[PDB]
Structure 1
Amino acid sequence: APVKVFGPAMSTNVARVTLCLEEVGAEYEVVNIDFNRNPFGQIPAFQDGDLLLWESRAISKYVLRKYKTDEVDLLRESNLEEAAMVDVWTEVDAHTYNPALSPIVYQCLFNESLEKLKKVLEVYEARLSKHSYLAGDFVSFADLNHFPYTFYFMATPHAALFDSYPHVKAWWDRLMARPAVKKIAATMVPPK
């Protein structure tokens, strides 16, 4: 039966989850809740029958595991080294990349971290020169994790910065072509 995601469609943490659900072809509903089993009262929340989860990354990994197939294996947990590189780049996204983007997005879309971001992008350029995707020659949760914040960065007048890092630009365009990513990009709008 269908699973439910609770939170705003355009939130970076909700988009992470909805992107995983689209990649694995799961049936799901997104429910817009107002703050008036989930002990910190956090959003996004996720229901799968009697299971209630929170923490966007934990919810995402549950989706990627539950719906895993031979053709859609985005954690690589049966290959120790591939799974390690998925985990490394998932943590680079959390600790290094999203913090380099986030204040440029905030500044620009709701009134000089550029030099820090250029240093990050140099490393990404080098990695994506050697490999198709961040964890190796396969798409993974590491790449998907980069979608939501980068999508908002691409709405700012700093979007063209990626043109100085041609392998990063090509990797970004590759993720943007994925049908699941296109579907979720379209959902990332305020409610109407």
Structure 2
Amino acid sequence: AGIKVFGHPASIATRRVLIALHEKNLDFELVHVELKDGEHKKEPFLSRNPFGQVPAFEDGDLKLFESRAITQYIAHRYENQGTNLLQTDSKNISQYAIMAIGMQVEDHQFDPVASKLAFEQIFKSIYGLTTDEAVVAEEEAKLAKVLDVYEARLKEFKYLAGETFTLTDLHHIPAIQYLLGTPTKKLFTERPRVNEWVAEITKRPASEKVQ
């Protein structure tokens, strides 16, 4: 439909992409890739992503993978529709770079820690597996250090990259949606600017659509 997302609706990375599409009011098809049958590890999925992970993506003839490459593509290709996901002046190179810092930070500092915490507290427990409280304590200490940085940043700017909501903020949303269903929620709540930021970005309609 121009646009197809090959993913899984529960996947943090698939949700990143979905949220960006909804922000742009785009029409698309979500094709739910059957992980139980190893569809991700077979042709033709492997021709969309030779690493065999979700999501992959198509916009007409253009074939992409890696969620953050896809969201950037959406933000540029559909720049003049829906929510602007770039900086207000998107051609300003120095402002772009400031947003790029935040995108890197999300990827390196936030996402791995948030992903472990979600797995330990949500995914495991639903089986009968016992959440490893030492992993949870270690990862929460890391996440608290990250969120202390975010708190200081959000004292100076409304959103992470400046005055407006961008890809930097968007990329956090799916992991945060999951963590708000765990006791790790307290880390967000106890930091007042972080708490306001979380409340704002998770109440967006595009965010609620994928939840």
- What is the TM-score with the length of structure 1 in the denominator? 0.90
Which residue pairs with 2:191 in the alignment? 165
Alignment of structure 1 residues 87-126 onto 2, 5 Å: 87-109=100-122, 110=124, 111=131, 112=137, 113-126=139-152
Which residue pairs with 2:207 in the alignment? 181
| Bigger shift: residues 34-43 or 104-113 | 34-43
Among candidates 160, 163, 171, match of residue 134 of structure 1: 160
Q: Does 1:41 align with 2:52?
A: yes
Q: Is the 8 A contact 2:3 2:60 kept in 1?
A: yes
Which residue pairs with 2:173 in the alignment? 147
Distance in 2, matches of 1:84 and 1:149, equals: 24
Which residue pairs with 2:86 in the alignment? 75
Distance in 1, matches of 2:52 and 2:188, equals: 37
Distance in 2, matches of 1:82 and 1:175, equals: 21
Considering only aligned residues, what root-mean-square deviation do their CA atoms show, in Å?
1.6
Describe the shift of the 1:105–1:41 C-alpha distance in structure 2 as closer, same or farther (beyond 3 A).
closer
Larger Rg, first or second structure (1 or 2): 2
Q: Does 1:51 align with 2:97?
A: no
Deviation sequence 1:65-105 (CA, Å, 0-9, x none): 11111763312341112211111011110111112322221
Deviation sequence 1:108-132 (CA, Å, 0-9, x none): 1113122221111111111011111
| Count of aligned residue pairs for this structure pair | 185
Show structure 1 runs of 5+ residues with no match: 186-192
| Bigger shift: residues 34-43 or 101-110 | 34-43
Deviation at 1:55, TM superposition (A): 1.1
* Corresponding letter in the other structure for 1:52: K
Show structure 2 runs of 5+ residues with no match: 125-130, 132-136
Distance in 2, matches of 1:91 and 1:58, equals: 12
